[PDB]
Short mmCIF file of C-alpha atoms (C1' of nucleotides) in Angstrom, two decimals:
data_model
loop_
_atom_site.label_atom_id
_atom_site.label_comp_id
_atom_site.label_asym_id
_atom_site.label_seq_id
_atom_site.Cartn_x
_atom_site.Cartn_y
_atom_site.Cartn_z
CA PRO Q 1 0.00 0.00 0.00
CA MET Q 2 1.35 3.40 -1.08
CA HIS Q 3 2.28 5.73 1.82
CA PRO Q 4 -0.59 8.23 2.39
CA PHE Q 5 1.78 11.19 1.97
CA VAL Q 6 2.89 9.90 -1.43
CA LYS Q 7 -0.73 9.18 -2.42
CA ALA Q 8 -1.69 12.74 -1.46
CA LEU Q 9 1.20 14.17 -3.45
CA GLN Q 10 0.29 12.03 -6.46
CA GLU Q 11 -3.36 13.19 -6.38
CA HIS Q 12 -2.45 16.85 -5.93
CA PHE Q 13 0.22 16.90 -8.64
CA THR Q 14 -2.06 15.05 -11.06
CA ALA Q 15 -4.88 17.57 -10.47
CA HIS Q 16 -2.55 20.33 -11.68
CA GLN Q 17 -1.04 18.55 -14.67
CA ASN Q 18 -0.40 20.44 -17.88
CA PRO Q 19 -0.27 18.18 -20.95
CA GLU Q 20 0.69 21.13 -23.15
CA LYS Q 21 3.86 21.79 -21.16
CA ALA Q 22 4.48 18.08 -20.59
CA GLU Q 23 5.33 17.57 -24.28
CA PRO Q 24 8.28 20.01 -24.52
CA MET Q 25 9.39 19.07 -21.00
CA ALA Q 26 9.61 15.39 -21.98
CA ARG Q 27 11.40 16.24 -25.23
CA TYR Q 28 14.01 18.22 -23.29
CA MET Q 29 14.94 15.05 -21.37
CA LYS Q 30 15.11 13.17 -24.67
CA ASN Q 31 11.85 11.38 -23.92
CA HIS Q 32 13.38 9.17 -21.23
CA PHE Q 33 10.48 10.06 -18.92
CA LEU Q 34 6.80 10.85 -18.85
CA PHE Q 35 6.01 14.29 -17.39
CA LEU Q 36 2.88 15.76 -15.81
CA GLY Q 37 3.96 19.20 -17.09
CA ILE Q 38 4.58 20.96 -13.78
CA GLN Q 39 7.57 23.28 -13.54
CA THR Q 40 9.69 23.85 -10.44
CA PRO Q 41 8.05 26.86 -8.76
CA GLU Q 42 4.58 25.31 -8.87
CA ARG Q 43 5.90 21.81 -8.11
CA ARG Q 44 7.48 23.07 -4.88
CA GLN Q 45 4.29 24.90 -3.89
CA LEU Q 46 2.23 21.77 -4.47
CA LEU Q 47 4.61 19.85 -2.21
CA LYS Q 48 4.32 22.66 0.35
CA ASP Q 49 0.52 22.31 0.20
CA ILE Q 50 0.72 18.65 1.11
CA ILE Q 51 3.23 19.22 3.91
CA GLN Q 52 0.92 21.90 5.34
CA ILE Q 53 -2.07 19.54 5.36
CA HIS Q 54 -0.45 16.24 6.37
CA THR Q 55 2.79 17.35 8.02
CA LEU Q 56 6.11 15.88 6.94
CA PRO Q 57 6.15 12.14 7.74
CA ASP Q 58 8.23 10.75 10.60
CA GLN Q 59 11.88 10.13 9.66
CA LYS Q 60 11.23 6.38 9.93
CA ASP Q 61 9.38 6.74 6.60
CA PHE Q 62 12.00 8.91 4.82
CA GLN Q 63 13.64 6.27 2.60
CA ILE Q 64 10.27 4.58 1.96
CA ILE Q 65 8.72 7.80 0.63
CA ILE Q 66 11.72 8.54 -1.59
CA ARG Q 67 11.64 5.07 -3.11
CA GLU Q 68 7.88 5.13 -3.72
CA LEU Q 69 8.21 8.48 -5.49
CA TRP Q 70 11.22 7.16 -7.42
CA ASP Q 71 9.02 4.32 -8.68
CA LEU Q 72 6.28 6.58 -10.09
CA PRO Q 73 6.42 7.18 -13.86
CA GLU Q 74 6.28 10.97 -14.11
CA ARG Q 75 9.56 12.82 -13.69
CA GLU Q 76 8.10 15.41 -11.33
CA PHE Q 77 7.86 12.70 -8.69
CA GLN Q 78 11.63 12.16 -8.68
CA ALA Q 79 12.13 15.92 -8.55
CA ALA Q 80 9.73 16.04 -5.58
CA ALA Q 81 11.58 13.13 -3.97
CA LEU Q 82 14.77 15.18 -4.06
CA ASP Q 83 12.99 18.21 -2.55
CA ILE Q 84 11.77 15.89 0.19
CA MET Q 85 15.23 14.44 0.76
CA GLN Q 86 16.52 17.97 1.37
CA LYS Q 87 13.86 18.27 4.09
CA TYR Q 88 15.35 15.20 5.82
CA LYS Q 89 18.94 16.39 5.23
CA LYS Q 90 19.89 16.41 8.91
CA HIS Q 91 19.15 12.68 9.16
CA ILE Q 92 21.46 11.69 6.30
CA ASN Q 93 24.91 10.31 7.07
CA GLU Q 94 27.59 7.97 5.70
CA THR Q 95 25.31 4.97 6.19
CA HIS Q 96 23.13 6.32 3.37
CA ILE Q 97 25.78 6.04 0.67
CA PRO Q 98 24.41 2.79 -0.80
CA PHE Q 99 20.86 4.25 -0.69
CA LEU Q 100 22.10 7.25 -2.67
CA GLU Q 101 24.01 5.01 -5.09
CA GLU Q 102 20.79 3.16 -5.85
CA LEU Q 103 19.02 6.45 -6.55
CA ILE Q 104 21.84 7.40 -8.91
CA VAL Q 105 21.52 4.22 -10.99
CA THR Q 106 17.70 4.10 -11.20
CA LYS Q 107 15.60 6.49 -13.33
CA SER Q 108 19.03 7.90 -14.27
CA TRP Q 109 19.58 11.16 -16.11
CA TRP Q 110 21.57 14.36 -15.60
CA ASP Q 111 18.77 16.13 -13.75
CA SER Q 112 18.50 13.60 -10.92
CA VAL Q 113 22.18 12.68 -10.75
CA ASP Q 114 23.34 16.33 -10.55
CA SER Q 115 20.82 16.89 -7.74
CA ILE Q 116 22.14 13.96 -5.71
CA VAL Q 117 25.89 14.16 -6.16
CA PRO Q 118 27.53 17.55 -5.39
CA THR Q 119 25.07 18.16 -2.56
CA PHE Q 120 24.20 15.00 -0.64
CA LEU Q 121 27.22 12.87 -1.51
CA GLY Q 122 29.51 15.91 -1.53
CA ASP Q 123 28.53 16.70 2.05
CA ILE Q 124 28.97 13.11 3.20
CA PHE Q 125 32.46 12.74 1.74
CA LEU Q 126 33.51 16.13 3.13
CA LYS Q 127 32.65 14.82 6.60
CA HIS Q 128 34.03 11.33 5.88
CA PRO Q 129 36.90 11.63 3.38
CA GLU Q 130 38.21 8.25 4.52
CA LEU Q 131 35.22 6.62 2.81
CA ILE Q 132 35.97 8.03 -0.64
CA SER Q 133 38.22 5.09 -1.52
CA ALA Q 134 35.50 2.60 -0.54
CA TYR Q 135 33.33 3.93 -3.41
CA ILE Q 136 35.09 6.07 -6.00
CA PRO Q 137 37.26 3.30 -7.48
CA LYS Q 138 34.20 1.02 -7.90
CA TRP Q 139 32.22 3.84 -9.51
CA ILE Q 140 34.94 4.52 -12.03
CA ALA Q 141 35.35 0.81 -12.77
CA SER Q 142 31.63 0.31 -13.23
CA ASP Q 143 29.80 0.17 -16.54
CA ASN Q 144 27.67 3.04 -15.33
CA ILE Q 145 28.15 6.54 -16.73
CA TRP Q 146 26.16 8.04 -13.87
CA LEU Q 147 28.43 6.54 -11.17
CA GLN Q 148 31.37 7.77 -13.23
CA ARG Q 149 29.82 11.24 -13.38
CA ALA Q 150 29.26 10.99 -9.60
CA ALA Q 151 32.97 10.31 -9.08
CA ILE Q 152 33.79 13.45 -11.09
CA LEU Q 153 31.22 15.81 -9.57
CA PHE Q 154 31.06 14.95 -5.86
CA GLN Q 155 33.80 17.54 -5.18
CA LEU Q 156 32.17 20.20 -7.38
CA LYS Q 157 31.43 22.66 -4.58
CA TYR Q 158 34.50 21.91 -2.44
CA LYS Q 159 36.37 25.10 -3.38
CA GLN Q 160 39.39 25.38 -1.07
CA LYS Q 161 38.59 21.92 0.31
CA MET Q 162 39.16 20.29 -3.09
CA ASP Q 163 41.50 17.27 -3.05
CA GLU Q 164 43.47 18.23 -6.16
CA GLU Q 165 45.45 15.00 -6.40
CA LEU Q 166 42.22 13.02 -6.22
CA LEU Q 167 40.36 15.23 -8.70
CA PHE Q 168 43.08 14.92 -11.30
CA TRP Q 169 43.44 11.19 -10.71
CA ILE Q 170 39.71 10.71 -11.28
CA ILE Q 171 39.82 12.85 -14.44
CA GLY Q 172 42.84 10.94 -15.69
CA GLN Q 173 40.93 7.68 -15.37
CA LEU Q 174 38.01 9.00 -17.40
CA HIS Q 175 39.64 11.36 -19.90
CA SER Q 176 39.37 8.88 -22.79
CA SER Q 177 35.63 8.36 -22.40
CA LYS Q 178 33.62 9.09 -25.56
CA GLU Q 179 30.52 9.71 -23.44
CA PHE Q 180 29.18 13.26 -23.57
CA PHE Q 181 28.01 13.23 -19.95
CA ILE Q 182 31.51 12.24 -18.83
CA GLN Q 183 33.35 14.72 -21.06
CA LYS Q 184 31.06 17.54 -19.99
CA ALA Q 185 31.26 16.71 -16.27
CA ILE Q 186 35.06 16.85 -16.53
CA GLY Q 187 34.75 20.26 -18.19
CA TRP Q 188 32.33 21.51 -15.56
CA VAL Q 189 34.33 20.43 -12.52
CA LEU Q 190 37.53 21.95 -13.96
CA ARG Q 191 35.75 25.21 -14.88
CA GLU Q 192 34.28 25.41 -11.40
CA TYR Q 193 37.51 24.60 -9.60
CA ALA Q 194 39.36 27.15 -11.74
CA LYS Q 195 37.30 29.78 -9.88
CA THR Q 196 39.29 28.78 -6.78
CA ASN Q 197 42.67 27.87 -8.31
CA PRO Q 198 43.00 29.00 -11.95
CA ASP Q 199 46.77 28.32 -12.20
CA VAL Q 200 46.40 24.65 -11.30
CA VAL Q 201 43.57 24.08 -13.75
CA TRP Q 202 45.36 25.91 -16.56
CA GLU Q 203 48.53 23.87 -16.02
CA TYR Q 204 46.50 20.67 -15.94
CA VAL Q 205 44.66 21.34 -19.20
CA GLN Q 206 47.84 22.37 -21.03
CA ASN Q 207 49.74 19.26 -19.94
CA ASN Q 208 47.27 16.36 -19.84
CA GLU Q 209 45.06 14.80 -22.52
CA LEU Q 210 41.37 15.72 -22.46
CA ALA Q 211 38.48 15.39 -24.89
CA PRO Q 212 38.09 18.64 -26.87
CA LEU Q 213 34.75 19.34 -25.15
CA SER Q 214 36.30 18.89 -21.71
CA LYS Q 215 39.16 21.30 -22.43
CA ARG Q 216 36.94 23.92 -24.11
CA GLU Q 217 34.50 23.91 -21.19
CA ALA Q 218 37.28 23.96 -18.56
CA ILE Q 219 38.85 27.16 -19.91
CA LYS Q 220 35.63 28.91 -20.92
CA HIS Q 221 36.45 31.71 -18.46
CA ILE Q 222 40.13 31.37 -17.56
CA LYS Q 223 41.23 31.66 -21.18
CA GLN Q 224 40.64 35.37 -20.53
CA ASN Q 225 43.15 35.24 -17.65
CA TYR Q 226 45.93 33.64 -19.68
CA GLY Q 227 45.28 34.51 -23.30
CA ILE Q 228 44.88 32.43 -26.45
CA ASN Q 229 48.27 32.06 -28.13
CA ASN Q 230 48.60 32.61 -31.88
CA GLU Q 231 48.89 29.21 -33.57
CA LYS Q 232 50.36 30.09 -36.99
"C1'" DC I 1 34.57 21.31 -33.87
"C1'" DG I 2 32.98 25.52 -31.38
"C1'" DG I 3 30.18 29.53 -31.29
"C1'" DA I 4 25.36 31.54 -30.96
"C1'" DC I 5 21.13 31.18 -29.09
"C1'" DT I 6 16.79 29.11 -25.89
"C1'" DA I 7 14.59 28.27 -21.72
"C1'" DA I 8 14.61 27.16 -16.77
"C1'" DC I 9 16.58 27.21 -12.42
"C1'" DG I 10 19.88 28.86 -8.49
"C1'" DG I 11 21.41 32.52 -6.25
"C1'" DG I 12 23.96 37.25 -5.90
"C1'" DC S 1 17.13 43.09 -11.70
"C1'" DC S 2 21.62 40.56 -12.91
"C1'" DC S 3 24.80 36.38 -14.12
"C1'" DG S 4 26.20 31.51 -14.38
"C1'" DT S 5 24.72 26.77 -15.05
"C1'" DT S 6 22.83 21.66 -15.93
"C1'" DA S 7 21.06 20.90 -20.43
"C1'" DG S 8 18.80 21.80 -25.35
"C1'" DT S 9 18.76 23.20 -30.90
"C1'" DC S 10 20.99 25.17 -34.82
"C1'" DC S 11 24.50 27.16 -37.89
"C1'" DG S 12 29.22 27.74 -40.42
#
DNA sequence: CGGACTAACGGG
DNA sequence: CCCGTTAGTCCG
């Protein structure tokens, strides 16, 4: 039996569906998912409505509610699940890594994976850096582009706390990937980290092989700092 | 390739 | 208001 909070959310979202918007929204995600057609501002309000009426469920039900929402067809339910997980943030710890892994590799796409990785997993590994090597090597070795992207992006927001040796090691392992979502994640994490340490990122990109997309994205801004040499 | 543009979302 | 970003399409 579906949890009453999830049932209430399903009814309320469905009552406000927009088939006209659902079409372009589904196309944007390359038709991997059905959509109700509800964009983020309204989707968060509809969740708010249900929390106001029912109250947020006891923490004992947290993982259950996330999984039930994950199993519903329309993409807005996974987006809502992530909003709900943020509400239970203070209950999440290192013991939830496998739970988060399973979310990464089910109903997988860039929208859900990017919402799980730099935030929830990033925070966990900042608190428990000793656990990185229990997961990152397996992720990289896996057949799964989303675990590979997770390995790249978990340090995205680390700024001065970035483990540079680790970042570059991870990138080195994945630099030959022909997968767009890997090449782009490499570009993104380098571009972001260059905001903290431009010299290190510039040196890396000039001295290590990267896919063209990865390099181009990495230096999107810092090419202004260093210049674009004449090629002849 | 890589630049220009679109549309939505996060946050100064 | 602005800017920076996951994507996305389109054009030499």
